[PDB]
């Protein structure tokens, strides 16, 4: 059938037009199946391919538009887990009060050997 | 019953659609040797719901 | 019975239910 | 004796793997000894069996030479041309006798272009090993 590699550089309008025809070919194929077929299986996946390429481009352009924005959309946010997304950054967790940090510098960790 | 809700009707429809025997080609493809679908129901003997 | 020293073993508790009050040492060589 | 705890010596786990192997594993489990002449040219002992390979059966039953036209991966057996069961009547479609890849020697390989690359990779790794590590 179609290959995604071919449709990746196609206008969003051209991909939108191609989907319209592939979906009309999915009506005619369904109609001929019921009224009385490798093409049906092929055109179902072709509609899927055009739809993956259309979505990837819009999601990519949208990601880029809100990239470098405070509060980017939730779909474009990192994966993580609820637990990881509520955790404390290892900079926040290793923050020590000024006095405690001073005593770390005052008495630095050392290497020694006992005979 | 002649007055049913769409939700009740839809679950009943699925029960009718799936009350079918194993397709003969599937018996050949899978080499089943166990032709009966044991999930098949009969309105007279079975109580759905 | 006859001349025996009375046992000072307490009766097993929570044997089939409740907290697991029996520990096993098959993890010892590991 | 195996010194890798991660490999299993359980009959059940070994036989579960054999009868539930993924097709890539199943294909390498279906390998045959390359012929002495083919072994010298390709410098590798065994190749996975493929359609169009000419094999000679050394096993006594249904023993002959032929071309594999069908690989039955699910039953781990191959169909050689000429190796067929006696037909009930003369005018009937031939039924192939399934032969185990192990029972045959590969006299000729269907060379292709990927196989040329694959037999070369194997021989490069066999060079590193034969260089005594």
């Amino acid at each position: 059938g179609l290959k995604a590699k071919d449709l990746v550089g196609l206008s969003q309008e051209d991909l939108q037009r191609k989907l319209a025809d592939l979906k009309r070919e999915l009506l005619s194929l369904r109609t001929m199946k019921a009224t009385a077929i490798a093409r049906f299986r092929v055109c179902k996946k072709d509609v899927a391919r055009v739809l993956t390429v259309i979505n990837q481009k819009a999601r990519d352009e949208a990601r880029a538009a809100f990239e470098g924005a405070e509060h980017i959309p939730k779909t474009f946010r990192p994966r993580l887990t609820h637990a990881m997304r509520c955790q404390l950054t290892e900079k926040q967790k290793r923050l020590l009060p000024s006095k405690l940090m001073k005593r770390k510098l005052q008495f630095p960790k050392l290497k020694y050997a006992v005979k | 019953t002649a007055n049913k809700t769409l939700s009740r009707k839809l679950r009943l429809a699925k029960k009718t659609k799936t009350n079918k025997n194993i397709p003969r080609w599937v018996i050949a493809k899978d080499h089943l040797k166990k032709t009966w679908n044991y999930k098949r129901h009969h309105w007279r003997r079975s109580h759905l719901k | 019975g006859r001349n025996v020293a009375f046992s000072n073993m307490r009766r097993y508790k929570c044997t089939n239910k409740g907290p697991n009050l029996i520990k096993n040492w098959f993890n010892q060589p590991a | 004796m195996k010194l890798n705890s991660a490999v299993t010596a359980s009959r059940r786990k070994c036989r579960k793997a054999y009868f539930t192997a993924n097709a890539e594993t199943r294909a390498k489990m279906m390998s045959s000894r390359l012929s002495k002449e083919l072994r010298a040219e390709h410098k590798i002992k065994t190749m996975p069996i493929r359609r169009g390979d000419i094999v000679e059966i050394f096993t006594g039953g249904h023993k002959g030479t032929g071309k594999v036209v069908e690989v039955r991966r699910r039953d781990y057996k191959i169909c050689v041309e000429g190796i067929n069961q006696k037909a009930r009547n003369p005018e009937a479609k031939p039924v192939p006798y399934p032969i185990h890849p192990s029972n045959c020697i590969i006299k000729e390989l269907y060379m292709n272009g990927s196989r040329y690359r694959a037999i070369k990779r194997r021989q490069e790794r066999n060079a590193e090993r034969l260089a005594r590590i």
Binding site: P97 | - | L21, K23 | -
Partner: protein
């Protein structure tokens, strides 16, 4: 006031020791109850401590200090940054506030408190465990 067991009609059947519904006394202070009550009303905040504000014959009022563990100032302040740890989630529900700790006997230490140390339940489990070692 004192507690009245929720048994229908006042009847707690069974052994006579386990009868008696009015005049029973709560095992947790009313300070602990005050902190458990504000935990349920606001489960998005972590409870730090509470103090007595006022009393009447009918009611006793306690003010509870609760921390938002997801505010920028709190997360980056090293002094209160520990409240943001997940293990301090609804600490009152696990008896970890000062009043809950008193009610669990953890203000006492030494003789008197040696069967209530990891926990009352844990001590009983460590004492009543049967070891069954290999080379017994």
């Amino acid at each position: 006031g004192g507690r009245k067991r929720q048994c229908v009609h006042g009847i707690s059947y069974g052994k006579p020791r386990n009868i008696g519904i009015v005049g029973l006394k709560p095992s947790r202070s009313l300070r602990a109850l005050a902190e458990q009550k504000v935990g349920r009303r606001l489960p998005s905040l972590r409870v730090l401590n509470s103090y007595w504000v006022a009393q009447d014959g009918s009611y006793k009022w306690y003010e509870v200090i609760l921390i938002d563990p997801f505010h920028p100032w709190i997360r980056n302040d090293p002094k209160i940054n520990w409240i943001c740890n997940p293990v301090m989630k609804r600490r009152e529900c696990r008896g970890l506030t000062s009043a809950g700790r008193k009610a669990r006997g953890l203000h006492n230490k030494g003789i008197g408190a040696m069967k209530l140390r990891p926990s009352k339940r844990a001590a009983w489990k460590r004492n009543h465990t049967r070891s069954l070692r290999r080379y017994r």
